[PDB]
Amino acid sequence: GETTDGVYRVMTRRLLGSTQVGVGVMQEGVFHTMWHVTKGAALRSGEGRLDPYWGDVKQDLVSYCGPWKLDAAWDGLSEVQLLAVPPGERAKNIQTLPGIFKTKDGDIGAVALDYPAGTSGSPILDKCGRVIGLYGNGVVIKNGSYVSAITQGKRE
């Protein structure tokens, strides 16, 4: 299978034609996506198979082939880029200054950008190109617009 670092589309044939159900990040031989994209199912890369290794429905994260690798963090100050990968459209960077999810357990960065649900799993980058989390789990606000957490896993 293709183990090259980078951003990937997650596709299903189970519906009409080929449908993009989301996006993930290949890094250090591990595929990283959101749980709601795959529901923990196996994946194909060519005629290689990726099996789930870790996941958590509450964090809404899942790693394939190995443990979660992405440990970079929003610094709470600087702008970031959503590397958006929309269905049937080219990878596009969209630069933004994150907002905040205030929770009983702590503050999380949030990015306010509207894309189809199939863009779930698109990585969020710091100025050094490091993935500080994945886009696609969040809320709809008093306007009808989407706001996503910067969702990051833990490394061990």
Partner 1 sequence: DMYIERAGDITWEKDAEVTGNSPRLDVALDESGDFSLVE
Ligand X SMILES: CN(C)Cc1nc(CNc2cc(Cl)cc(C(=O)NC(C)(C)CO)c2)cs1
Residues forming the active site? 36, 60, 120
- Alpha-carbon gap, residue 145 to 12, rounded angstroms: 27
| Residue 136 contact, options partner 1, ligand X, none, Cβ 5-8 Å cut-off depending on partner type | ligand X
Helices (H) and strands (E) in the chain, counts: 1, 15
Token pair in block for residue 54: 């870790």
- 68, 31 Cβ separation under 8 angstroms: no
Choice between 50 and 63, CB closer to partner 1 = 50
| Residue 156 contact, options ligand X, partner 1, none, Cβ 5-8 Å cut-off depending on partner type | none
- Alpha-carbon gap, residue 111 to 28, rounded angstroms: 26
- 60, 35 Cβ separation under 8 angstroms: yes
Q: Is residue 64 close enough to count as binding ligand X by CB under 6 A?
A: no
For the bound state, the minimum distance from the C-beta of residue 24 to ligand X, rounded and expressed in Å, comes to 13
Q: Is residue 66 close enough to count as binding partner 1 by CB under 8 A?
A: no
Q: Is residue 33 close enough to count as binding ligand X by CB under 6 A?
A: no
Among 115, 124, 152, 153, binds ligand X (CB under 6 A): 115
Q: How far is CA 31 from CA 20, 100, 121, in A?
A: 16, 27, 11
For the bound state, the minimum distance from the C-beta of residue 46 to ligand X, rounded and expressed in Å, comes to 27
- 86, 115 Cβ separation under 8 angstroms: yes
Q: Is residue 75 close enough to count as binding partner 1 by CB under 8 A?
A: no
Choice between 104 and 156, CB closer to partner 1 = 104
Q: Is residue 155 close enough to count as binding partner 1 by CB under 8 A?
A: no
Q: Is 37 helix (H, G, I), strand (E, B) or coil?
A: helix
Interface ranges with ligand X (CB under 6 A): 36, 60, 114-117, 119-120, 135-137, 140, 146, 148
